[PDB]
Scaffold this active site. Structure first.
Site, PDB file in Angstrom:
ATOM      1  N   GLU A  21     -12.421   1.880 -26.489  1.00 44.26           N
ATOM      2  CA  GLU A  21     -12.252   2.865 -27.548  1.00 44.26           C
ATOM      3  C   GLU A  21     -13.444   3.803 -27.586  1.00 44.26           C
ATOM      4  O   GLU A  21     -14.566   3.353 -27.779  1.00 44.26           O
ATOM      5  CB  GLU A  21     -12.037   2.199 -28.905  1.00 44.26           C
ATOM      6  CG  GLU A  21     -10.863   1.235 -28.895  1.00 44.26           C
ATOM      7  CD  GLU A  21     -10.510   0.736 -30.293  1.00 44.26           C
ATOM      8  OE1 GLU A  21     -10.663   1.534 -31.242  1.00 44.26           O
ATOM      9  OE2 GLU A  21     -10.119  -0.463 -30.409  1.00 44.26           O
ATOM     10  N   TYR A  23     -14.907   5.851 -29.681  1.00 38.26           N
ATOM     11  CA  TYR A  23     -15.852   5.840 -30.796  1.00 38.26           C
ATOM     12  C   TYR A  23     -16.744   4.585 -30.813  1.00 38.26           C
ATOM     13  O   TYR A  23     -17.867   4.629 -31.348  1.00 38.26           O
ATOM     14  CB  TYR A  23     -15.155   6.071 -32.142  1.00 38.26           C
ATOM     15  CG  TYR A  23     -14.594   4.822 -32.800  1.00 38.26           C
ATOM     16  CD1 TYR A  23     -13.311   4.388 -32.534  1.00 38.26           C
ATOM     17  CD2 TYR A  23     -15.356   4.090 -33.712  1.00 38.26           C
ATOM     18  CE1 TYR A  23     -12.786   3.227 -33.179  1.00 38.26           C
ATOM     19  CE2 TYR A  23     -14.846   2.960 -34.356  1.00 38.26           C
ATOM     20  CZ  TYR A  23     -13.559   2.525 -34.072  1.00 38.26           C
ATOM     21  OH  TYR A  23     -13.076   1.387 -34.718  1.00 38.26           O
ATOM     22  N   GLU A 186      -0.194  -2.860 -34.651  1.00 39.85           N
ATOM     23  CA  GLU A 186       0.064  -1.517 -35.232  1.00 39.85           C
ATOM     24  C   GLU A 186       1.195  -0.684 -34.577  1.00 39.85           C
ATOM     25  O   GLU A 186       1.006   0.508 -34.243  1.00 39.85           O
ATOM     26  CB  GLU A 186      -1.247  -0.711 -35.320  1.00 39.85           C
ATOM     27  CG  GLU A 186      -2.282  -1.319 -36.278  1.00 39.85           C
ATOM     28  CD  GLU A 186      -3.512  -0.467 -36.552  1.00 39.85           C
ATOM     29  OE1 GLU A 186      -3.747   0.518 -35.826  1.00 39.85           O
ATOM     30  OE2 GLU A 186      -4.253  -0.762 -37.531  1.00 39.85           O
ATOM     31  N   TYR A 249      -7.407   0.588 -44.685  1.00 38.61           N
ATOM     32  CA  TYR A 249      -8.502   1.576 -44.703  1.00 38.61           C
ATOM     33  C   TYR A 249      -8.267   2.640 -45.785  1.00 38.61           C
ATOM     34  O   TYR A 249      -7.149   2.788 -46.312  1.00 38.61           O
ATOM     35  CB  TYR A 249      -8.612   2.288 -43.347  1.00 38.61           C
ATOM     36  CG  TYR A 249      -8.926   1.382 -42.168  1.00 38.61           C
ATOM     37  CD1 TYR A 249     -10.169   0.741 -42.034  1.00 38.61           C
ATOM     38  CD2 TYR A 249      -7.970   1.191 -41.167  1.00 38.61           C
ATOM     39  CE1 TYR A 249     -10.422  -0.092 -40.926  1.00 38.61           C
ATOM     40  CE2 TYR A 249      -8.221   0.397 -40.064  1.00 38.61           C
ATOM     41  CZ  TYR A 249      -9.437  -0.235 -39.937  1.00 38.61           C
ATOM     42  OH  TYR A 249      -9.617  -1.005 -38.814  1.00 38.61           O
ATOM     43  N   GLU A 256      -7.384  10.205 -49.548  1.00 44.65           N
ATOM     44  CA  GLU A 256      -8.133   8.949 -49.602  1.00 44.65           C
ATOM     45  C   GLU A 256      -9.635   9.201 -49.584  1.00 44.65           C
ATOM     46  O   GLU A 256     -10.373   8.561 -50.320  1.00 44.65           O
ATOM     47  CB  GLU A 256      -7.733   8.048 -48.440  1.00 44.65           C
ATOM     48  CG  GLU A 256      -6.335   7.469 -48.554  1.00 44.65           C
ATOM     49  CD  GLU A 256      -5.854   6.867 -47.250  1.00 44.65           C
ATOM     50  OE1 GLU A 256      -5.462   7.635 -46.344  1.00 44.65           O
ATOM     51  OE2 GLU A 256      -5.859   5.623 -47.130  1.00 44.65           O
ATOM     52  N   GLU A 286      -7.613  -6.330 -40.094  1.00 50.63           N
ATOM     53  CA  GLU A 286      -8.377  -5.137 -39.783  1.00 50.63           C
ATOM     54  C   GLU A 286      -8.712  -4.380 -41.062  1.00 50.63           C
ATOM     55  O   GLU A 286      -7.833  -4.058 -41.882  1.00 50.63           O
ATOM     56  CB  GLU A 286      -7.586  -4.241 -38.825  1.00 50.63           C
ATOM     57  CG  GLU A 286      -8.368  -3.730 -37.748  1.00 50.63           C
ATOM     58  CD  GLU A 286      -7.589  -2.853 -36.784  1.00 50.63           C
ATOM     59  OE1 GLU A 286      -6.507  -3.275 -36.289  1.00 50.63           O
ATOM     60  OE2 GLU A 286      -8.098  -1.737 -36.518  1.00 50.63           O
TER      61      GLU A 286
END
Ligand SMILES: O=[N+]([O-])c1ccc(O[C@@H]2O[C@H](CO)[C@@H](O)[C@H](O)[C@H]2F)c([N+](=O)[O-])c1
Ligand SMILES: *[C@H]1O[C@H](CO)[C@@H](O)[C@H](O)[C@H]1F
Length: 394
Positions: A21, A23, A186, A249, A256, A286
């Site tokens: 990933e 990031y 997911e 999240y 949000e 998660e």
């Protein structure tokens, strides 16, 4: 090996290890930048391996797989009072499509990790994180911006991969370590055919049980509303040892992100209340400490942050630069983070427990259990509260 009625999961994801990933390990992607131009940076593992070619990809990944997580990490995890890890792995570790650019070799390290888990009294879920064609179009599926898991033979190939995982890791050999196999991370409910997704989950459930495995089946909620899965895979129909995985999240939309800290906490507390009402065992597999989407490439390679009005038509809320280094954080931001973590922990311990994303990152502190613990922001011991009883659970 686990009592889902009486025990609480206190764990971490081992992200960025077997599925790249950007990031999380930006050092592997940054060499492709041309000054400030990111237009030539590969956006996912698919394109990274394709651009490098098989030989360079395998040399670089072998070094990554052998150093990113080691036995020492498992000792540190146990020492911190954690009892559990979730291990993401892609389909390509087991089976390649014709013309897939991916390289293999992950399985040798997966099997080392299972031993390290055993030795340190840590239990495990194996999580199929990427399916052929992609189940969500996220870079963390392996293939960004594609949604073809339900097309062609891709669902059948995914089931074949799961059967391999079932025979290897759902049997007697690992029954003291493996407490769940998660069928698919997911799947993006809104863009999928939900009847076909349900059929896939049922086929996976039946195929595992037909091997003589008693291992719990973990289904991700497919971004459906709380309670959606109450009537699926039920004891009334002789279907048993099923756990629902909810992910949570508050950073992937402008709405949000603009909430004040008190409203962030109210939303976290409500996650607990709502999960309590469900009829399956459930675990928060998660979540993180993030209150911004500022981490470089969190939204993907060559995409900016909603938080500073640089993506997804979000308005500017604040500058990301000051928030990239935890040593530059204001006292107020540190306090807000600690409050937010504690509220989430109480909400998730109210049902099956929690699995923080992730154990480590190169330089994204909101997403690193290590960095947060070492800076006093994640409770240690994990039962410690500076802000006790924010939610009022009974
Ligand atoms: O509509 N949805 O169900 C849905 C799902 C995930 C969504 O957000 C997704 O969340 C993932 C974490 O679960 C991240 O890895 C992805 O980068 C993000 F797009 C969004 N979204 O973008 O706001 C919407
Ligand atoms: C859950 O979300 C995080 C944050 O977007 C990703 O890094 C993981 O791969 C995904 F499973």
């Amino acid at each position: 090996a686990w009592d889902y009625d009486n025990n609480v999961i206190r764990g971490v994801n081992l992200g960025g290890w077997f599925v790249l990933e950007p990031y999380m390990t930006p050092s592997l992607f940054e060499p492709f930048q041309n000054g400030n131009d990111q237009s030539g940076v590969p956006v996912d593992e698919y394109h990274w391996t394709q651009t490098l070619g098989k030989e360079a990809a395998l040399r670089i990944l072998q070094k990554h797989w052998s150093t990113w997580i080691t036995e020492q990490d498992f000792k540190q995890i146990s020492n911190l009072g954690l009892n559990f890890v979730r291990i993401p792995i892609g389909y390509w570790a087991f089976q390649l499509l014709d013309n897939d650019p991916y390289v293999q070799g992950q399985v040798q390290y997966l099997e080392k990790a299972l031993g390290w888990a055993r030795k340190n009294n840590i239990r495990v879920w194996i999580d199929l994180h990427g399916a052929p064609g992609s189940q969500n179009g996220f870079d963390n599926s392996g293939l960004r911006d594609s949604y073809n898991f339900q097309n062609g033979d891709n669902t059948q190939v995914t089931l074949n991969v799961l059967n391999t995982i079932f025979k290897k890791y759902g049997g007697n050999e690992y029954s003291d370590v493996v407490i769940g196999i998660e069928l698919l991370n997911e799947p993006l409910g809104p863009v999928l055919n939900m009847d076909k997704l349900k059929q896939f989950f049922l086929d996976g459930y039946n195929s595992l049980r037909q091997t003589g495995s008693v291992t719990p089946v973990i289904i991700h909620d497919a971004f459906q509303v709380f309670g959606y899965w109450n009537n699926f895979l039920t004891v009334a129909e002789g279907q048993w040892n099923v756990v629902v995985d909810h992910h949570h999240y508050q950073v992937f939309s402008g709405g949000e992100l603009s909430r004040n800290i008190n409203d962030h906490i109210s939303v976290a507390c409500n996650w607990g209340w709502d999960a309590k009402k469900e009829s399956h065992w459930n675990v928060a597999g998660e979540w993180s400490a993030a209150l911004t989407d500022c981490a470089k490439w969190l939204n993907g390679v060559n995409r900016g942050a909603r938080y500073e009005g640089a993506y997804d038509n979000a308005p500017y809320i604040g500058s990301c630069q000051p928030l990239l280094d935890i040593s530059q954080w204001s006292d107020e931001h540190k306090t807000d983070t600690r409050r937010y973590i504690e509220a989430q922990l109480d909400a998730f311990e109210y049902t099956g427990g929690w699995v923080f994303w992730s154990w480590k990152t190169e330089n994204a502190p909101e997403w690193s259990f290590q960095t947060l613990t070492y800076n006093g922001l994640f409770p240690q011991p994990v039962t410690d509260r500076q802000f006790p009883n924010q939610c009022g659970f009974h």
